[PDB]
Design a binder for this molecule. Structure first.
Ligand SMILES: [Zn+2]
Ligand SMILES: [Zn+2]
Ligand SMILES: [Zn+2]
Ligand SMILES: [Zn+2]
Ligand SMILES: [Zn+2]
Ligand SMILES: [Zn+2]
Ligand SMILES: [Zn+2]
Lengths: 214, 225
C-alpha cells in the first residue's frame, strides 16, 4: 500500500525538447524508485533504478532525480523513438507498486477535423439493426466532442467511439463514432446528425442526413 | 542473452482453469526471482506476486492473494501463473519479469513478450461487413470518405485491407470496441479524391482467422431516393 502518483497523465512534446515527468509516493521510499518505458503491444523496458542510476544500455539522455517522496524522470533532448508511455515503480517495500503512467505524445499545430456521416446499409437493416457512423479525419489535438442528435434530440447511451494512435506521417488523430438503433427505432425518425466540437473549429460543425432523402 | 519467453495467447470461458508459462534462458534460473505483472486493456501495470525459484517462496499482492497461484519448476527453468476458475475480469496481458537487485532495490530488468488472455462467454464468430458511403448529395468537397463497418465478431483480431492491398494511403483502421453483446465491432475508412467516385472501385477485404472467414465488400451508396 505505497501509492504512486505520476503527473501529468499525458503530455505533448517535440523532438529536441527537455521533457520532465514526476512521480510522488504516499510515503518515503528513500531512493528506491525505478522508471520503465512501454510502447503499444510491447513489454516494458527498464530505464533507471535507485532514483538516479542508468540501466545498462539505455541512452544517457534519460536521467532521474529525487529522494523520499518526490521524483522526476528527465529526457533531455527528446528523440523520435522516445514517444511512449513511462511508469515509475517503488521498490522500498512489498508490494511493489507502479504509478499509473505518463503518455508522451507528439506536439504539432492545431488541425480541425474533416467530418463525414454515413447512413446504415440496406443489408444491415434487413437483419434488424441500424448503425450510423460519424468520422472525424486527421485532427489535432486529441480532445474532441461528438454529439449525436436524432430528430434534433441529443442521444445518450447508444453510441461508442474509438480513436487511432497518432498518424505516422502528420501526427494527427482520427475518430469513429457509431450510433446503434434497432431497425424499428431507426425507421420512426427523420433527421440523423452528428455534431462535432473541436479547438480547430470556430463553431461546432454538424453533418446530417434525412431518412427518405439520403 | 537473458531471455524470458511466455506461452501463447489464450481465449477461454469464465469458470475454466488456466495455467500459463514463462521459461527463462541465458542465465542461472534459480539465482533470480520471477515476478508476474497484469496489464488490463487500456490500463497500467499491476504487480501480482513473485516467486523465488530456488525454494518456491512466494509473495502475493493482497489484491491477488487467493485468486492466483504462482509456481516454478526449476528443473526446466519455468515459472507459472494459474487460475482454478477464470472470470471475464481476468482479461488482460500478463507479463513475467526477472528481478535484478541493484542499487539495493528489486528491478524488473528482463521481461517476457507477454501472454494475452481473453476470458469471455462468447463463442467464435465471423464478422458481418457493411459499406460506409455518403448520401448522394453529401459529397461537398474534393475529398470524400468511404469505409466498411466490421460488425459482430469474436474474438479479436480482424485484418482489413483495401483493393487487395493496392490501397494503403489515407486508410484508418480503428480499434475495435466491445459491444454489450460480447461481440466486437470496428470500422476502417479511407479518404479518396471525390472525382474518383464511380470511375474507380473501392473494396474492403476483411479476414478473421479465428472463424476462418474472409469477406469482401465493394463500397458505394445504393440510391433509391
Ligand atoms: Zn485520414
Ligand atoms: Zn423521432
Ligand atoms: Zn427508403
Ligand atoms: Zn481478493
Ligand atoms: Zn448498387
Ligand atoms: Zn440514397
Ligand atoms: Zn436498386
Amino acid at each position: 500500500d505505497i501509492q504512486m502518483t505520476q503527473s501529468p497523465s499525458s503530455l505533448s512534446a517535440s523532438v529536441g525538447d527537455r521533457v520532465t515527468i514526476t512521480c510522488r509516493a504516499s510515503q518515503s521510499i528513500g531512493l528506491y524508485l525505478a522508471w520503465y518505458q512501454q510502447k503499444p503491444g510491447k513489454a516494458p523496458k527498464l530505464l533507471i533504478y535507485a532514483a538516479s542510476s542508468l540501466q545498462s544500455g539505455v541512452p544517457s539522455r534519460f536521467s532521474g532525480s529525487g529522494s523520499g517522496t518526490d521524483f522526476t524522470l528527465t529526457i533531455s533532448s527528446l528523440q523520435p523513438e522516445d514517444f511512449a508511455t513511462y511508469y515509475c515503480q517503488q521498490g522500498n517495500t512489498l508490494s511493489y507498486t507502479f504509478g499509473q503512467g505518463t503518455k508522451v505524445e507528439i506536439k504539432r499545430t492545431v488541425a480541425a477535423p474533416s467530418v463525414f456521416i454515413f447512413p446504415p446499409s440496406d443489408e444491415q437493416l434487413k437483419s434488424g439493426t441500424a448503425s450510423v457512423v460519424c468520422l472525424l479525419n486527421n485532427f489535432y489535438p486529441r480532445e474532441a466532442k461528438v454529439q449525436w442528435k436524432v430528430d434534433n434530440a441529443l442521444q445518450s447511451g447508444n453510441s461508442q467511439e474509438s480513436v487511432t494512435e497518432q498518424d505516422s506521417k502528420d501526427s494527427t488523430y482520427s475518430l469513429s463514432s457509431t450510433l446503434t438503433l434497432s431497425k424499428a427505432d431507426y425507421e420512426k425518425h427523420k433527421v440523423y446528425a452528428c455534431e462535432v466540437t473541436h479547438q480547430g473549429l470556430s463553431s461546432p460543425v454538424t453533418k446530417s442526413f434525412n431518412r427518405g432523402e439520403c | 542473452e537473458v531471455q524470458l519467453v511466455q506461452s501463447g495467447a489464450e481465449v477461454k470461458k469464465p469458470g475454466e482453469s488456466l495455467k500459463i508459462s514463462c521459461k527463462g534462458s541465458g542465465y542461472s534460473f534459480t539465482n533470480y526471482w520471477i515476478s508476474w505483472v497484469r496489464q488490463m486493456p487500456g490500463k497500467g501495470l499491476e504487480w501480482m506476486g513473485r516467486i523465488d525459484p530456488s525454494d518456491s517462496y512466494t509473495n502475493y499482492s493482497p489484491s491477488f492473494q487467493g485468486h492466483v497461484t504462482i509456481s516454478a519448476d526449476k528443473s526446466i527453468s519455468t515459472a507459472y501463473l494459474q487460475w482454478s476458475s477464470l472470470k471475464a475480469s481476468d482479461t488482460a496481458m500478463y507479463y513475467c519479469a526477472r528481478q535484478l537487485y541493484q542499487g539495493y532495490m528489486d528491478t524488473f530488468d528482463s521481461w517476457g513478450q507477454g501472454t494475452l488472455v481473453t476470458v469471455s462467454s462468447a463463442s467464435t464468430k465471423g464478422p458481418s461487413v457493411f459499406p460506409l458511403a455518403p448520401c448522394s448529395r453529401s459529397t461537398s468537397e474534393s475529398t470524400a470518405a468511404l469505409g466498411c463497418l466490421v460488425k459482430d465478431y469474436f474474438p479479436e483480431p480482424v485484418t482489413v485491407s483495401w483493393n487487395s492491398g493496392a490501397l494503403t494511403s489515407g486508410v484508418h483502421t480503428f480499434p475495435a470496441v466491445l459491444q454489450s453483446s460480447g461481440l466486437y465491432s470496428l470500422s476502417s475508412v479511407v479518404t479518396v479524391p471525390s472525382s474518383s467516385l464511380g470511375t474507380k472501385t473501392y473494396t474492403c477485404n476483411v479476414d478473421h482467422k479465428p472463424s476462418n472467414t474472409k469477406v469482401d465488400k465493394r463500397v458505394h451508396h445504393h440510391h433509391h431516393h
